[PDB]
Amino acid sequence: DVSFRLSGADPRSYGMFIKDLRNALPFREKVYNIPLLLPSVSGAGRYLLMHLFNYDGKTITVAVDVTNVYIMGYLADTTSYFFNEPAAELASQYVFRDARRKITLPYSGNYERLQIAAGKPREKIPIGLPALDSAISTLLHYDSTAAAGALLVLIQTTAEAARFKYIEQQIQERAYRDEVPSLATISLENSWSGLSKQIQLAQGNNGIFRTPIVLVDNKGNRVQITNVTSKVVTSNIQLLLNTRNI
């Protein structure tokens, strides 16, 4: 398991939690010095538990698929909550089995669906550590519309920060003041599967992308990623989604 306490949190302690989350995900191989997530994990070991505590010490436990860093669902007191998708249904067989009832949220966990359920695209929802405090407070007690926004904040501040060092640093900048994600943040979140695919294929193509990836960089500017010496591959990406799961 990994934990993050918002009470007393600072950029350093958030950075330690994201390091904890990345290190809980198993890998057998690195490709260009980046951990390659596993094709597959049978049974209960597939799911990592993240214990998150709001400013007031109230807690949720979030279940995370270790092959793709996808949040499946979460435990608040005696109620489990799962996304309306087959992989979350599967997770509910292994995690949160001492729960009084199980609510299937009325949406899948993908970004397009959560955005429709929340009524706002990610482009317009402030992110940061205070936002994660609010998200944890929202999820303690069922509210499906409120929970869509809260889940968009939870995913970006945990899973997306684990996947990209730049996103971790953007949340550190937002330790005490929320701000809509940067253009580079939304670009990287949208591009993780594509970059993961092109980095694995570059093994066999002399570190050259078979299909170049269009991103936004830290200065707001277009950058075309054509090969593995790019800063996105050498510094930024921290985990690779396995080609088998693309």
Ligand X SMILES: Nc1ncnc2c1ncn2[C@H]1C[C@H](O)[C@@H](COP(=O)(O)O)O1
Binding flag, residue 205, ligand X (CB under 6 A): no
Q: Lay out the site mask for ligand X across 150-169 (x = CB under 6 A, - = otherwise).
A: -----x---x----------
Shortest CB 100 distance to ligand X, Å: 24
Distance, in Å, from the CA atom of 187 to the CA atom of 164, rounded to the nearest integer, reads 11
Q: How far is CA 75 from CA 51, 123, 130, 165, in A?
A: 9, 28, 21, 28
As given in the structure block, the two tokens for residue 149 are: 């926004």
- Helix, strand, or coil (residue 171): helix
Q: Which of 107, 136, 189, 213 binds ligand X (CB under 6 A)?
A: 189
Q: Which of 31, 50, 69, 171 binds ligand X (CB under 6 A)?
A: 69
Q: How many residues bind ligand X (CB under 6 A)?
A: 12
- What are the residue numbers of the active site? 160
Q: Are strands 34-37 and 70-76 parallel, antiparallel or unpaired?
A: unpaired
Binding flag, residue 70, ligand X (CB under 6 A): yes
Identify the DSSP state of 156. Answer: I
Shortest CB 37 distance to ligand X, Å: 12
Distance, in Å, from the CA atom of 152 to the CA atom of 136, rounded to the nearest integer, reads 12
Q: Which of 78, 84, 193, 203 binds ligand X (CB under 6 A)?
A: 193
- Given the complex with ligand X, which of 48 and 129 has the nearer CB atom? 48
